[PDB]
Write a protein that binds this ligand. Sequence first.
Ligand SMILES: Nc1nc2c(ncn2[C@@H]2O[C@H](COP(=O)(O)OP(=O)(O)O)[C@@H](O)[C@H]2O)c(=O)[nH]1
Ligand SMILES: Nc1nc2c(ncn2[C@@H]2O[C@H](COP(=O)(O)OP(=O)(O)O)[C@@H](O)[C@H]2O)c(=O)[nH]1
Ligand SMILES: O=P(O)(O)OC[C@H]1O[C@@H](n2cnc3c(OP(=O)(O)O)ncnc32)[C@H](O)[C@@H]1O
Ligand SMILES: O=P(O)(O)OC[C@H]1O[C@@H](n2cnc3c(OP(=O)(O)O)ncnc32)[C@H](O)[C@@H]1O
Ligand SMILES: [Mg+2]
Ligand SMILES: [Mg+2]
Lengths: 431, 431
Amino acid sequence: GNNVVVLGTQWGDEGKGKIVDLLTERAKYVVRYQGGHNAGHTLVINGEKTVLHLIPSGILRENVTSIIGNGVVLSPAALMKEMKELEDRGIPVRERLLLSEACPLILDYHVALDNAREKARGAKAIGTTGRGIGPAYEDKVARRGLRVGDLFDKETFAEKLKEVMEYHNFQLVNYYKAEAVDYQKVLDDTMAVADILTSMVVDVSDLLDQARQRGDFVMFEGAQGTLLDIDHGTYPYVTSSNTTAGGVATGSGLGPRYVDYVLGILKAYSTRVGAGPFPTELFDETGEFLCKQGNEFGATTGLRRRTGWLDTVAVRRAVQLNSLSGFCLTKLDVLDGLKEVKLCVAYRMPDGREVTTTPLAADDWKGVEPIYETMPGWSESTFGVKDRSGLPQAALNYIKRIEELTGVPIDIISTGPDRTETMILRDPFDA
Amino acid sequence: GNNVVVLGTQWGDEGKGKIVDLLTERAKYVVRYQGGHNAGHTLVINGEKTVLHLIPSGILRENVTSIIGNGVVLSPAALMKEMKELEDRGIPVRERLLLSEACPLILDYHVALDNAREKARGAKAIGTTGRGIGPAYEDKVARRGLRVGDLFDKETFAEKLKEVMEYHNFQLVNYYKAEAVDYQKVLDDTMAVADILTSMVVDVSDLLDQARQRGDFVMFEGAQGTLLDIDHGTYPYVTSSNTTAGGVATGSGLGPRYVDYVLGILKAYSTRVGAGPFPTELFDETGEFLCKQGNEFGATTGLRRRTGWLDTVAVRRAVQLNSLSGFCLTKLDVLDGLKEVKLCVAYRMPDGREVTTTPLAADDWKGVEPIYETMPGWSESTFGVKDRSGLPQAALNYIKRIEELTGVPIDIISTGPDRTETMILRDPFDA
Ligand SMILES: Nc1nc2c(ncn2[C@@H]2O[C@H](COP(=O)(O)OP(=O)(O)O)[C@@H](O)[C@H]2O)c(=O)[nH]1
Ligand SMILES: Nc1nc2c(ncn2[C@@H]2O[C@H](COP(=O)(O)OP(=O)(O)O)[C@@H](O)[C@H]2O)c(=O)[nH]1
Ligand SMILES: O=P(O)(O)OC[C@H]1O[C@@H](n2cnc3c(OP(=O)(O)O)ncnc32)[C@H](O)[C@@H]1O
Ligand SMILES: O=P(O)(O)OC[C@H]1O[C@@H](n2cnc3c(OP(=O)(O)O)ncnc32)[C@H](O)[C@@H]1O
Ligand SMILES: [Mg+2]
Ligand SMILES: [Mg+2]
């Protein structure tokens, strides 16, 4: 299919960055359609690590035009920081990166707010990445936030910014009893970059409609994961954007009927950073194992990540929410050396009922317990293996079992962090 | 196609209610996926008017199950009010209506807030319908708002509600210097209806995935219109939800790949209630005419509606944003008796540039001017006509011209408010 969507089917960090980088070889465009720099994508090419947050993961391929879709909450400071870093490394970002004038801006007060709220919640704290994602989205929805296109008139921008800031400042000092955020500091930091920012603007919907009508290969890059969806995730322990395939058309402006294949990234084992339900969470040795081997620590905040077994029930919600076309089994190489692996196939609800469907809001997950299927592990190494043949049968069964349990084929299997450490069984672009 | 989406291509009020009611004859389900009771849908069957706001327009057909999707901001008071009204009229709502536990709740403070903000904006006031749509969506995104499923535990609900209310109350009295909203009044009004509310809950995504897998005819009913889209509309003069086809999958939980046909409702002339850009707005006799004949006054607030000529440029943005499959030319009967009609085919930008693309945010529409195409009108009456033959050639040309100018066929033509006063040239369900 021409328009391919790559997204996380769990709670982020499944490995979208690598896969997006990999798959963009044949792509004309790559589009981020939601989130901001809370995202953390690690690309590894012949050993060279590149960590992207706000910039689309297709930025390393000169044949691809990376787009920041209107859905993205964009931090000028964050963009500048990343651009500079890639530029020093030979990546002419400004030559490859375009962006929507409709993108809301993440300015300092947003982080001020993000921190304050987080504080206020005390114990039942969400565990947000500390960027100002939440407030930026709130300001969008409230229709008071600033967007890229607001920089088209700096004086008017100073007017709007003065307003929005006094408004937020009042809340910060009087209610939160927190320090105000200096309006002039913000206006200044902003105006300095404004010109660079404005230079990358393009009418994204139209560009995408044109690309679409030409047949251009376009990849949409997801941020965060399905279960962190503001609507469909473990609310309120979620991110503030729709991480489900529906955000592509809303955050890019491309009509929904033009999505061709939805590729869902699947970690082979589960992780979460932030508070919230997690039935298959492990707190034992194997958990520790899964964490160490997988080097599970957030690419955007370091914070160790919670680990647990893959959960076909949660994965199955992801399948329906996103119209999955196929999966990209990632980190299989991490299971190597376990005596046995297991998949959560059903949930035992607190009233005794057994169910193969997930609850929605966090409180409804309160006391659910996982009912497992236990498969034999494999001692052979699968790291770097690039052909099914190189995988032991135990691994092949685990893979088939996931397919059986989900009804979606594993078209791509990843066995290490490096771009080429992958098995492309079915390339979504031909699919 | 099995899953058909019906939405407004302009600024609301194109006539979704009638069309949805009409088209649901063959439907198993009808789903609202966004907005709340700011919407106003007028159904007319053999002269009997029915005005829906929050309840899906398929509620009058016992063969159809009406669903309030998670995307909808739901006012318990509003729901109760409408249910009662339909029940007295022989409509057993509770028997036909189901709803998502994920729907955020619109409670009193939300209206308190909606009013306060509106006040604060003074002159540059959005012109929101006065329901608490904006705040309810903000509370959603901020992850502090209450949802239907929160009623599954009334004590915890009282806890969460006490919190959210003190929070908002502080803002209302100290900043806005407005009157606080009584927590106990809210908790009470809510708890009284809670049980009814909870009784209608269903897991909508799953139900839709099942329906989808059965082949069931499902209609998604849009609220508001494309150009009022929070992301793609004339921001900030927009509604707080994505009125574009992308909201269907986000606000219903049905995977995006399962949308089959997107039907866009097209008024044949333009209207707007609320502040904001409107290039083809008319302030002359014909405007007055268009308003009087069309009886253009908001079904949700009465407020006279601004009128202007149809705008192919704005309509064309709608075509790409929503992947339109076809149009439903509505109110054609209203043009009868004009000497000449005209369509805006291009925009003359303020720097002299001529463009066939629309700007996004309001300020960017600032001084655009419409460049028209002037077609001969028609004196014959088209009211109630149900066969193309009954339409004068002048009308047929106007219709073909819209098709030529947009590239989307007019599969349905409506010539009066009554259900049967329509021409179904291509029924989306077979399409
Ligand atoms: N061992 C192993 N590491 C992988 C594999 N695929 C990706 N990685 C690494 O695992 C991490 C994926 O987390 P992250 O980059 O935050 O993924 P993203 O947030 O979804 O883009 C990064 O450290 C990658 O370098 C794989 O198949 N095996
Ligand atoms: N004259 C005329 N009225 C129509 C036609 N279709 C619908 N109506 C009426 O025009 C209005 C449509 O506005 P509204 O009900 O608010 O549409 P909605 O908000 O899109 O559901 C209602 O008064 C309908 O009764 C039509 O083809 N001709
Ligand atoms: O308001 P926010 O800043 O968005 O934080 C809210 C919640 O969402 C989580 N979170 C945010 N981005 C995440 C991410 O990005 P990628 O998978 O794309 O690499 N991966 C994993 N978890 C992520 C935070 O942990 C928290 O639970
Ligand atoms: O915050 P809000 O309460 O949503 O108001 C914001 C803006 O959106 C407009 N508006 C809201 N619902 C509308 C509607 O519903 P239907 O077309 O579905 O019948 N039709 C037309 N205009 C509508 C208001 O006029 C205002 O411009
Ligand atoms: Mg990451
Ligand atoms: Mg209406």
